[PDB]
Amino acid sequence: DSCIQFTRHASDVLLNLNRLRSRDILTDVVIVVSREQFRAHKTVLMACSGLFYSIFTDQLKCNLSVINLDPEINPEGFCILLDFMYTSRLNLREGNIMAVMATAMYLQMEHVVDTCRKFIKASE
Amino acid sequence: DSCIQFTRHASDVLLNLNRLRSRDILTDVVIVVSREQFRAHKTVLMACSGLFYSIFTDQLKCNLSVINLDPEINPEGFCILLDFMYTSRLNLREGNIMAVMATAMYLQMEHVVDTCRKFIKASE
Amino acid sequence: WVIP
Amino acid sequence: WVIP
Ligand SMILES: N#Cc1c(Cl)ncnc1Nc1ccc2c(c1)CC(=O)N2
Ligand SMILES: N#Cc1c(Cl)ncnc1Nc1ccc2c(c1)CC(=O)N2
Ligand SMILES: [Cl-]
Ligand SMILES: [Cl-]
Numbered sequence: 001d002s003c004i005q006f007t008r009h010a011s012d013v014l015l016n017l018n019r020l021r022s023r024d025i026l027t028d029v030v031i032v033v034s035r036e037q038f039r040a041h042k043t044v045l046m047a048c049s050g051l052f053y054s055i056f057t058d059q060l061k062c063n064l065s066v067i068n069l070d071p072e073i074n075p076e077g078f079c080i081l082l083d084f085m086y087t088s089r090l091n092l093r094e095g096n097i098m099a100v101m102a103t104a105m106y107l108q109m110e111h112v113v114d115t116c117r118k119f120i121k122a123s124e
Numbered sequence: 125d126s127c128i129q130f131t132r133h134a135s136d137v138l139l140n141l142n143r144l145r146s147r148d149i150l151t152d153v154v155i156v157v158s159r160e161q162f163r164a165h166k167t168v169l170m171a172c173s174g175l176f177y178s179i180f181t182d183q184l185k186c187n188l189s190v191i192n193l194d195p196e197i198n199p200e201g202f203c204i205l206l207d208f209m210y211t212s213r214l215n216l217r218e219g220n221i222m223a224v225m226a227t228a229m230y231l232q233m234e235h236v237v238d239t240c241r242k243f244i245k246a247s248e
Numbered sequence: 249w250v251i252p
Numbered sequence: 253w254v255i256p
């Protein structure tokens with residue numbers, strides 16, 4: 001086509017989606033990770049995670065308002081990844097890298113798994 | 125903070141949101157523009173438009189599944205803008221620029237109004 | 249705005 | 253990935 005493109009559009013959309021999340025506006029699911037709960041938008045989760053894409057395209061699970069993750073999943077690891085989904089920013093640290101990588105593998109977030117593997121290989 | 129950032133993340137999220145829209149997955153509103161209907165996600169509309177942000181933060185309107193736009197709004201103009209919201213790409217042409225600008229003004233999409241004004245000024 |  |  002002969003379209004023009006607004007460079008910052010995708011980033012501005014994501015910034016607004018994060019603002020809606022912070023104010024709990026039109027959030028439609030709560031992700032339970034052991035003792036912790038995280039409110040989010042199903043569409044953003046599906047757009048970032050192979051696991052959530054699978055869950056919310058399921059004819060029964062698409063209607064659930066609560067999703068319980070595997071008890072081995074670390075809440076801090078999940079929190080860091082949920083923040084990444086809504087911001088493009090990953091708070092990767094020596095103290096959390098193993099939990100972040102294991103959570104990214106479970107959530108099926110290939111690019112996060114890739115940078116974790118690379119940061120781990122550099123430290124060995 | 126000491127975060128790392130994935131450059132393509134925002135664009136990949138938007139691409140997936142558009143794929144969900146095309147397959148009618150978790151769309152939660154229909155926008156009626158005279159004889160035409162457009163299914164979309166409320167969060168994306170709010171993230172792109174001052175008008176939709178106002179509508180869906182309203183305590184009564186947030187729960188509506190159908191929103192009827194002003195009868196002066198052109199459906200093709202709306203379609204071009206809805207595509208822009210989900211892709212960052214604006215199909216701006218001599219034959220549609222007046223309708224696109226009027227629709228962008230109504231929807232409160234400042235950056236679209238700005239490029240329309242500039243393209244119009246160049247042709248006079 | 250750019251030509252993509 | 254970049255340093256933002
Ligand atoms: N929502 C949506 C969606 C759609 Cl519509 N099409 C294709 N992928 C979608 N999302 C999704 C699927 C697999 C993975 C990711 C996201 C990130 C990753 O590492 N794996
Ligand atoms: N959703 C959301 C939202 C939030 Cl949370 N905060 C601030 N703006 C939001 N969206 C929104 C408001 C005004 C305008 C636009 C988008 C584009 C434009 O030209 N005007
Ligand atoms: Cl439930
Ligand atoms: Cl990823």
Ligand SMILES: [Cl-]
Pocket residue numbers: 187188189190
């Ligand atoms: Cl309704």
Ligand SMILES: [Cl-]
Pocket residue numbers: 172233234235236
């Ligand atoms: Cl805009």
